[PDB]
């Protein structure tokens, strides 16, 4: 605020830059990043691969090499991506489970890329879409480990 | 027979004409007067009644439409035949079959019904109808009449009144509904009145009081028209989607009752409504509380009743922040005496057969004393004297509610409620025939003020001056406070030649202005680009700085225009004659609305009336120079600038200052202390304020460092031109 | 942060053109705003023979401010919205004028009693009728100051006082006694209602009033009413449960913190509806320290 | 002159008058969206000072829209672009910085209701079976739990 009238701030530049991301990451705890960085990279391969897929792989690259006809690399790792799209399924398969696993009762930003999620429309990406709704309610009830405990309890 | 509900218009004169389809009986209606005067009004009276017989519906619908063209032959005859410019003219249809059906889409049913005619209805001018129906369920079977009445006044506006009949004195109840039960033989209201009252204001130079919604309606469309020069507008609205009212009424308990009334049945001298409507600014809808004396009961004065619409419609209207307009034409508080007491109070002369030795008290006989004594009237003692035994009056403590120390109370309840309600919400203040005493202090606490010509804005009368001197000093109250005072004071911000043009001018400042203090400002598309140049240019020799502000003519190439600084057309000034070695006003800039200050460099010479009262005075006239602050200028500046802080608008002056006058008598006028509060006033706002040295202006020692930026940094921005000093 | 004692008295402002246009009503506004903002007492007092009219009145009557503002009149002073001259001047025209004569005058009585009488001859008929105008213009001018007089006398104090708009009357002598535990119960009673108001500042002034006059009725029993009406009794009360410390006085002070513990209780109840994902996490903080049998009560739900 | 006053920093430019509406114009409108977005920032946590409030606009300005486009906030134009493209999502897809502003606003309630008890940890039972009333069951287990 006092530093501010003169516009004397590279060194400064560099430390509220420096500072700024850190504590930007950190606002809302360790789920700051547990949020942000899986959900965030969640929509990273989803809208990745939803462009990728509207029809099939020819006329759909000729879609996407005319949307950026000029040029195609980054659209070529997208291609090389969805290659190993069984490689990708498991390791989906890996970040939610162990989200999906730890997570239950979360919020509305997530919800609303499942119900994005839940769109999508490939033989590969088919557990995702089953993965999208069995989570949904086993998140309602479960019958993970806690619930084990808890069910053991009961009985 | 009787079931013909003809006795609900037996406050009537009425003459029989021959029709056929004998059903329908017209007759033509003459006001029924006295004596005195003679009648107004010539209606067109026909009362019917069908008995012929889903299916119903559409039945009904072929008889009716028969009806209607038949009917309005027929009264098309008569209008040919001989027009007396008819007005409210009655229509009764009863139905005295039963069908069975839900009363909305009967509401819809009505409004088709009433509008595929439309031009038609307003040739024959048509205002009044009356049907029934009688509707049951079902399973019930017990047919019950349902009065649908039609209330539509100027204007094709429509208000639908439906009901259910029922009980002992039977009551039309069903929402809300205007008339939520009266029985059913209401003999006929004579408009005489509302004439009468209409007379009385036109005579007393004004409006009546229920007319101005109305006198809002041709305002607003002259807006409408003016104001898309202006700006890009939508296409109008529709008449009848541009406006709606809800009166607001007093229940037993002084308690805010939302009621669709009847105009004229107030019981004081004071009305509320709401209104929200579509306006330019606003073509989503804006509210504002609008609060107004009765000028024809009594004067306007100011009762506890009338206090308590004004305070608790005014504490809604705080509680969401949207704008209180007050329309303040009046006489100040109630005044009475207790009537009681007058006429029955004794005086105790010194000697009964000479007064002029004086009297000892006021009294009353104890046959007098002991009855009204009972009932908190008066506060008396007990004498003797000359043999007799007399009441001594102590305290006048007064049966008569609304005349005493209460209208005080309430009243000071309403200005400290007022008084936060300027620094809370916006205020608004009309003149329009004269405001004495209160009504004045409220309206400069109002804050804003337009002022029609020959109103005037006075505390004290300029008869009663001239009896305490001795002499009638002066001629008119206007001499105090018309806008040859006001205006030239600065007190009134705008002067207007009628009623309508002050409402219009009501409107047009409210075009710049946000709908409630919680609401952003309303923004325009102006048709002024802002890519453009100005094309008059300032000089280093004084002139007029409207030319820089709102351009001028072009000298060469007429009918051009030198484009000023803002949107053409849009510089719409105030308190204009008052210090007019500065300039201040509202304008749009790209069609954002902010207010602006800017001040003259040429030397005004001023003129200063004489006070006759003071026979010394002569009428002056002072050179004020250009580029100097005085103390009127800087007061004018402190105004403003607070004012429309108020408002919540950015504040632009165009700074040209040579200094501060420094002479014995300005000094002496205290244009320091003004400086402190300019201060203070700024450290008061809240929005952004613009201030830009315009080519060959110059500012020096005390107009800089009065407003340097650390007073509210957080708020305020300075620049200046190259050509400035 | 001073008290006021304003010896009040103005009949109101100046009204010829010169000083008008020269724009008193501005300033005259612009005290109305700032007593709006006094927060501490205001003790008013019109002395006698004094009189105070219209917009100054208007512009400081205690309704503005009742938590802060009392009004005092002596018994010799007048107070209205209108001096007698003008409301004499709309409320006694002609017709009052000679009506007042008619009702009161034996002389002028007498005269209409004549002019009451059928089958008089033109003689007396036109005579009586000179009667009447001379004997009531010879008469006007005092019953005109009657008349103002009789005007003012309706402005008094017993229907402000009835009507809940003064506090007292005093009598200059030892208005100064009185005022002076006067003022120093309503700074005190103040003092404490800042007490409470920090403690809980969504109460309303009304209510944390009726709190300290319940607690001390209550308390003190309900025999003992009676003893809240004498302002420097209270006075001697309410500083030795304040000031005497550590006795069994604190009592009050109990109570209040009763209440800051339940208006606490509530604004958690608010945060939790408004943001109930706070709970959870608002208690483990909470209860990094509390009794291990609270711990157990934990465990028991 | 008005080379010395800027050069001395009571004013912030020297302007040419032909440019002088169009410049205002955009800069005021821009000002103004500034305050409104201030008013509801200081409505979230009362603590912070409007000149904090300064710089964390500002700041979430180079966030938001990259450490690259500083420069861009001195230009009228392009923030004001940038302070509307926010306010238009309203019970729709909301931005980031309101989940922020939720968030800065719920962290102070915590603290409020942490310094209170804090003044008063002996109240924490009673206030808890309230607090339990909701989440409850997973909120007995991590109790018992730990």
Not at chain 1, 61 to 88: C, G
Not at chain 2, 395 to 401: L, P, Y
Not at chain 3, 165 to 189: A, G, M, N, P, Q
Request: charged share 25%; hydrophobic share 40%; proline share 5%.
């Amino acid at each position: 605020a006092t530093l501010n009238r003169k516009s004397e701030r590279e060194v400064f530049f560099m430390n509220t830059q420096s500072i700024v991301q850190l504590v930007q990451r950190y606002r809302s705890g360790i789920r700051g990043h547990m949020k942000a960085v899986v959900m965030d990279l969640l929509r990273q391969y989803l809208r990745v691969e939803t462009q990728f897929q509207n029809g099939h792989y020819d006329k759909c690259v000729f879609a996407l090499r005319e949307e950026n006809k000029s040029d195609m690399n980054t659209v070529l790792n997208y291609i090389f991506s969805h290659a190993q799209v069984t490689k990708k399924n498991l390791l989906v398969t890996m970040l939610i489970d162990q989200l999906c696993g730890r997570d239950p009762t979360l919020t509305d930003e997530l919800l609303n890329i499942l119900t994005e999620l839940t769109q999508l429309s490939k033989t590969t990406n088919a557990k995702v879409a089953l993965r999208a709704r069995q989570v949904l309610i086993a998140s309602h009830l479960p019958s993970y480990e806690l619930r084990h405990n808890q069910v053991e309890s009961i009985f | 027979a009787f079931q013909l509900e003809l006795n609900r218009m037996r406050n009537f004169d009425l003459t029989a004409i021959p029709c056929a389809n004998h059903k329908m009986h017209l007759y033509l209606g003459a006001a029924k007067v006295e004596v005195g005067t003679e009648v107004t009004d010539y209606r067109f009276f026909v009362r019917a009644i069908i008995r012929h017989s889903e299916a119903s519906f559409e039945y009904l619908q072929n008889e009716g439409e028969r009806l209607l063209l038949e009917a309005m032959d027929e009264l098309e005859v008569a209008f040919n035949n001989t027009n007396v410019r008819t007005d409210c003219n009655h229509i009764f249809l009863n139905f005295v079959p039963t069908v069975i059906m839900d009363p909305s889409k009967i509401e819809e049913s009505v409004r088709s019904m009433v509008m595929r005619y439309g031009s038609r209805l307003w040739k024959l001018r048509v205002l009044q109808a009356e049907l029934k129906i009688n509707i049951r369920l079902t399973p019930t079977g017990k047919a019950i009449p349902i009065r649908l009445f039609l209330t539509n006044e100027s204007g094709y506006y429509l208000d639908i009144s439906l009901y259910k009949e029922v009980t002992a004195q039977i009551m039309f109840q069903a929402k809300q509904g205007p008339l939520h039960g009266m029985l059913i033989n209401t003999p006929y209201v004579t408009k005489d009145l509302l004439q009468s009252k209409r007379f009385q204001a036109q005579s007393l130079g004004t409006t009546y009081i229920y007319d101005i919604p109305e006198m809002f309606r041709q305002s607003l469309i002259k807006l409408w028209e003016s104001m898309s020069t202006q700006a890009f507008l939508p296409s109008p609205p529709l008449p009848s989607d541009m406006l709606t009212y809800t009166e607001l009424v007093l229940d037993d308990q002084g308690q805010l009752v939302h009621m669709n009334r009847l105009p004229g049945g107030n019981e004081i001298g004071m009305v509320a409504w709401k209104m929200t409507f579509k306006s330019p600014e606003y073509p989503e809808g804006r509210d504002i509380i609008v609060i107004g004396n009765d000028i024809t009961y009594r004067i306007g004065s100011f009762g506890p009743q009338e206090d308590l619409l004004f305070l608790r419609a005014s504490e809604l209207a705080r509680a969401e922040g949207i704008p209180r307009i007050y329309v303040s034409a009046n006489s100040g508080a109630r005044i009475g005496l207790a009537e009681e007491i007058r006429h029955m109070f004794h005086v105790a002369w010194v000697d009964p057969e000479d007064p002029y030795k004086g009297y000892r008290y006021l009294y009353l006989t104890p046959q007098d004393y002991k009855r009204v004594s009972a009932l908190n009237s008066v506060h008396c003692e007990h004498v003797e004297d000359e043999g007799e035994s007399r009441y001594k009056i102590t305290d006048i403590i007064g049966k008569e509610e609304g005349i005493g120390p209460e209208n005080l109370r309430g009243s000071g309840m309403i200005a400290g409620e007022s008084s936060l309600a300027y620094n809370e919400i916006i205020t608004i203040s009309l003149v329009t025939c004269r405001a004495i005493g209160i009504g004045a202090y409220l309206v400069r606490l109002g804050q804003r003020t337009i002022q029609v010509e020959n109103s005037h804005l006075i505390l004290t009368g300029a008869g009663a001056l001239n009896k305490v001197l001795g002499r009638e000093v002066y001629t008119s109250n206007n001499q105090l406070g018309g806008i040859q005072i006001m205006h030239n004071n600065g007190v009134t911000h705008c002067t207007v030649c009628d009623d309508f043009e002050g409402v219009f001018t009501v409107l047009h400042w409210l075009s710049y202005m946000p709908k409630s203090v919680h609401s952003s400002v309303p923004l325009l598309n102006s048709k002024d680009p802002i890519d453009r140049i100005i094309e008059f240019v300032p000089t280093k020799t004084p002139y007029d700085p409207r030319w820089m502000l709102a351009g001028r003519p072009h000298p060469t190439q007429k009918g051009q225009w030198l484009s000023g600084f803002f949107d053409y057309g849009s510089f719409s000034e105030i308190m204009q004659p008052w210090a007019q070695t500065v300039v201040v006003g509202r304008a749009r800039l790209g069609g954002i609305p902010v207010g602006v200050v800017a001040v003259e460099t040429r030397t005004v010479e001023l003129s200063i009336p004489a006070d006759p009262a003071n026979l010394d005075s002569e009428a002056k006239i002072i050179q004020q120079a250009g580029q100097v602050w005085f103390p009127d200028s800087a007061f004018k500046t402190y105004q403003a600038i607070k004012d429309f802080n108020r408002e919540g608008l950015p504040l632009m002056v165009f700074a040209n200052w040579r200094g501060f006058s420094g002479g014995m008598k300005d000094m002496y006028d205290q244009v320091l202390k003004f400086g402190a509060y300019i201060v203070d006033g700024l450290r008061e706002c809240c929005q952004p304020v613009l201030v830009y040295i315009p080519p060959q202006a110059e500012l020096r020692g005390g107009s800089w460092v009065v407003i340097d930026s650390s007073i509210n940094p957080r708020h305020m921005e300075m620049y200046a031109d190259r050509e400035s000093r | 942060g001073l008290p006021l004692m304003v010896f009040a008295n103005w009949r109101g402002f100046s009204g010829g053109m010169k000083d008008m246009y020269d724009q008193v009503l501005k300033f005259g506004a612009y005290i109305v705003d700032g007593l709006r903002e006094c927060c501490q007492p205001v003790l008013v007092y019109i002395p006698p023979q004094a009189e105070l009219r219209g917009g100054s009145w208007v512009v400081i009557d205690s309704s503005i401010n009742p938590r802060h503002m009392e009004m005092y009149a002596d018994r010799e002073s007048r107070g209205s919205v209108l001096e007698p001259e003008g409301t004499v001047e709309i409320k006694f025209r002609r017709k009052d004028l000679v009506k007042t004569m008619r009702r009161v005058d034996p002389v002028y009585i007498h005269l209409a009693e004549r002019l009451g009488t059928p089958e008089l001859s033109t003689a007396e008929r036109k005579e009586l009728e000179n009667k009447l105008k001379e004997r009531e213009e010879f008469l006007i001018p005092i019953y005109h100051q009657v008349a103002v007089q009789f005007a003012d006398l309706h402005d008094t104090p017993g229907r402000m006082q009835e009507k809940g708009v003064i506090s007292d009357i005093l009598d200059w002598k030892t208005s100064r006694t009185f005022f002076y535990w006067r003022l120093r119960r309503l700074l005190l009673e103040d003092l404490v209602k800042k007490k409470i108001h920090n403690a809980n500042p969504e109460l309303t002034d009304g209510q944390i009033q009726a709190m300290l006059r319940r607690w001390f009725v209550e308390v003190e029993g309900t025999v003992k009413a009676y003893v809240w009406d004498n302002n420097k009794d209270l006075a001697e009360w309410l500083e030795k449960q304040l000031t005497e410390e550590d006795g069994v006085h604190s009592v009050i002070e109990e109570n209040i913190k009763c209440i800051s513990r339940d208006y606490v209780l509530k604004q958690i109840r608010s945060l939790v509806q408004a943001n109930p994902e706070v709970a959870m996490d608002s208690i483990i903080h909470m209860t990094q320290h509390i009794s291990p049998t609270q711990r157990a009560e934990v465990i028991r739900i």
